[PDB]
Structure formats: structure tokens, C-alpha cells
Amino acid sequence: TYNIILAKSALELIPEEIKNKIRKSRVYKYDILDSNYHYKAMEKLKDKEMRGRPDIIHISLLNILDSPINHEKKLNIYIHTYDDKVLKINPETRLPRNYFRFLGVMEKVLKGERNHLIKMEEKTLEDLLNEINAKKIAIMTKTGKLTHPKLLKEYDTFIIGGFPYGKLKINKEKVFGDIKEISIYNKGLMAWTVCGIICYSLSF
């Protein structure tokens, strides 16, 4: 089995520090931060540029869940979020293709309501890696060593930033497994594209 982790993911309930600037509307009734609707209220939010993008997770998970490697039951799928929650995604999850329906599902999960296909825990990325016994970890970043996707099969765990901008920071001294920074392309790609490339590298 392989672990795929979308980490520091821009999928959060509205931060306490800006709750007073954001109200539910008919246009967007969800308690999930989305910079398409909430940009001005995020003005003074820490790391604002890498937060409030649930759509990245939506499209990435649509790719992952429908991949041949996932149909073969060879993936364990995790969303680690900016505020250290971990969602474990059952391989047979039928994720709504409608963005707002996706938000409705995720909102309930993040508020601690039981979902039999998506399990939520408070958990750091480093703690997740150790708990799943990750040993050979590939951290995906454009700044990494350029690797033909053919070699990705040598790793047990893949980490992709679930955010638009910046670089994934991890405390390697808190992680038991070995971490290698890997690039699969000379250009910055979107998280869903990287997830897709990894997934199809594993089948083909």
C-alpha cells in the first residue's frame, strides 16, 4: 500500500481571529474559509496566502479517488490541514463533484460530526507520518531533486502541499522516516496535477 498525504491543506473552519469579519450568506453559507468569498476578511490573517482554498483539495481528491491505483485499493489517503486536523479518506468515498456539496460534507467532518467514510482527528503532520509508520517519504516540491515519476514506486509515502502558494515546511527531527524532497517538473504545478502524476506513476 502507498500513503498519499495532502498536507498543510487550505481547508479550515473560519479562524477565530476573523470570525467577527465573516458572516454566513445565501451566496456562501458554509463555515469553511474560502478566499473567493472571504478575501478582505483575511487581510491580517497569518499565512493568508496559503489558506482559504478548499477547491484545491476538492480537485485533488477527485483525481486521487478515481485513479486506477485507488480502484485497486493500493492507497491510503490523508488530508492534513493548516490547523493540524487529519482526515482519513476511505478509498470508496464518493466525493461530490459539486463544489458546494463538497463543502457541506467537509464542514460536518471538520465540526466533529460522524462520517463513516471520512474520519477526523487532531494531529500534526509529523505525528501522522510516525503513526502510519512512514519510512521512505517523498516530499513533493518544485525545489526538489528532479526525478522521473518512474522512481516514485521506491517510496511508501508521498506528501503534496494542499495549498496555492509557498513551500511545505516540516520538522524532520520529529519524523522517524527518511524524507527526500522530490521534483517531477521544472515548473510550479498545481497540487491536483502532482497528485495525478504520482497516482498514475504507481499504476503504469
Ligand X SMILES: Nc1ncnc2c1ncn2[C@@H]1O[C@H](CSCC[C@H](N)C(=O)O)[C@@H](O)[C@H]1O
Of 132 and 152, which has the nearer Cβ to a copy of itself? 152
Of 130 and 183, which has the nearer Cβ to a copy of itself? 183
Residue 148, contacted partner among ligand X, a copy of itself, none, CB below 5-8 A by kind = a copy of itself
Q: How far apart are CA 179 and CA 100, in angstroms?
A: 36
Beta strands in 16-129 (DSSP E): 75-81, 85-89, 118-122
3-class SS at 59?
helix
Is 189 annotated as a binding-site member? Answer: yes
Inter-residue contact 167 to 147 (CB < 8 Å):
no
Contact residues toward a copy of itself (CB under 8 A) are 26-27, 36, 55-56, 59, 62-63, 66-68, 71, 97-99, 101, 148-150, 185, 187, 189-190, 192-193, 196-197, 200-201, 204
Inter-residue contact 202 to 69 (CB < 8 Å):
yes
Residue in the block written with cell 531533486: 145
Residue 183, contacted partner among ligand X, a copy of itself, none, CB below 5-8 A by kind = ligand X
The 3-class SS string of 7-55 reads EEECCCECCHHHHHHCCCCCCCCCCECCHHHHCHHHCCCCCHHHCCCHH
> Binding residue for ligand X (CB under 6 A) from 191, 196, 201, 202?
191
Is 188 annotated as a binding-site member? Answer: yes
Which residue has its beta carbon closest to ligand X?
161
Residue 12, contacted partner among ligand X, a copy of itself, none, CB below 5-8 A by kind = none
Minimum distance from residue 35 beta carbon to a copy of itself (Å): 10
Give the binding range for ligand X (CB under 6 A) out of 16-24, 98-106, 109-117, 183-191: 183-191
Sheet holding 157-161, edge to edge: 118-122, 85-89, 75-81, 2-9, 157-161, 136-146, 178-183
Minimum distance from residue 59 beta carbon to a copy of itself (Å): 6
Query: Does 189 sit near ligand X (CB under 6 A)?
Result: yes
Q: How far apart are CA 82 and CA 85, in angstroms?
A: 8
Residues of this chain that interact with ligand X (CB under 6 A) are 140-142, 160-161, 163-168, 183-185, 187-189, 191, 194
